[PDB]
């Protein structure tokens, strides 16, 4: 996964304005080290500061001082929080006046289509989430520019911008297969009867591997295409 989220790490740091802001000293939060675990771009940006008065904190919003930070980053965190609204309220609380929230969330990605295609090789017209069904399983709305803009503005953010950014990369079959099998076990309970699972669950790995080897060569690459929403907002 991390080859693609690393591309979005540069986008999110650039869109936030942190490298060029007049707010000094920089007091930054990287939620759950979501950027730092996949990219050095933010850490390296701070290292390049002439000042040396800046601070970066990595910690988790999902359980910080009031009015403290100049920048809060949430890289692909809002769709996974237990309580996305509570987390957003916390972002507003811990930002200083003039502080910027920058977040990335998923709007589209191609791994659900590829999995669906593999599954419609099984006999039985078996059900599988569509791309929108899958996104909406947790914290629905964070794939919608209009939803996000209103959620941020309700809480007092202004100059709110929500921009879709497509990125494309490629991943080896073996790695793409393993990402799939982290997701499959989580879905089938929600979309198949126990009758359908006992009947077909055990063969999913083989057909998936078979479809993947079928389609993208034997040691080939699988494309990873996505659209992420890049959200920025100002706390007045």
Numbering used by the authors: 23 to 85, 115 to 287
Original authors' sentences:
In order to obtain detailed insights into the enzymatic mechanism of GtmA-catalysed methyltransfer, we crystallized GtmA in the cofactor-free form and in complex with SAM and SAH, and refined the structures at 1.66 Å, 2.28 Å and 1.33 Å resolution with R-factors of Rapo = 16.8, RSAM = 19.2, RSAH = 13.9, and Rfree-values of Rfreeapo = 18.6, RfreeSAM = 23.4, RfreeSAM = 16.6, respectively. The apo form crystallized in space group P62 with one chain in the asymmetric unit, whereas the complexes appeared in two different crystal forms belonging to space group P21 with two monomers as the asymmetric unit in both cases. The flexibility is more pronounced in the lower domain, which is also evident by the finding that almost no ordered water molecules can be observed in the electron density of this region. The apo structure adopts a similar conformation as the SAH complex; however, parts of the upper domain (the first 22 residues of the N-terminus including parts of α1 and residues 86–114, including the complete secondary structure elements β3 and α4), are not visible in the electron density. In order to investigate possible structural rearrangements and gain mechanistic insights into this transformation, we structurally elucidated the GtmA-apo, GtmA–SAM and GtmA–SAH-bound structures. These structures revealed several flexible parts of the upper domain (α1, α4 and β3) which are not visible in the electron density of the apo structure. Interestingly, the two important residues Ala54 and Asp82 are part of β-strands β1 and β2, two regions connected by a disulfide bridge formed by Cys55 and Cys80 in the apo structure. This disulfide bridge appears to be reduced in the cofactor-bound structures, leading to a movement of the two β-strands towards the cofactor. We investigated the possible relevance of the disulfide bridge by carrying out microscale thermophoresis (MST) to determine the affinity of GtmA for SAM under reducing and oxidizing conditions; however, the affinity of GtmA for SAM was similar in both cases.
We and others have shown that A. fumigatus effects dithiol gliotoxin S-methylation via a methyltransferase, gliotoxin thiomethyltransferase A (GtmA or TmtA) located outside the gliotoxin gene cluster. GtmA consists of two domains, a larger ‘upper’ domain containing a Rossmann-fold involved in binding the co-substrate SAM and a smaller ‘lower’ domain that changes its relative position to the upper domain in the three crystal structures described here. apo-GtmA seems to be highly flexible, as indicated by the higher B-factors. In agreement with Duell et al., who have recently published the structure of a GtmA–SAH complex in the same crystal form as described here, the cofactor binding site of GtmA is located in the upper part of a cleft between the two domains built by helix α1, sheet β2 and loop regions connecting β1–α2 and β3–β4. Our data suggest that GtmA methylates dithiol gliotoxin by a non-processive mechanism.
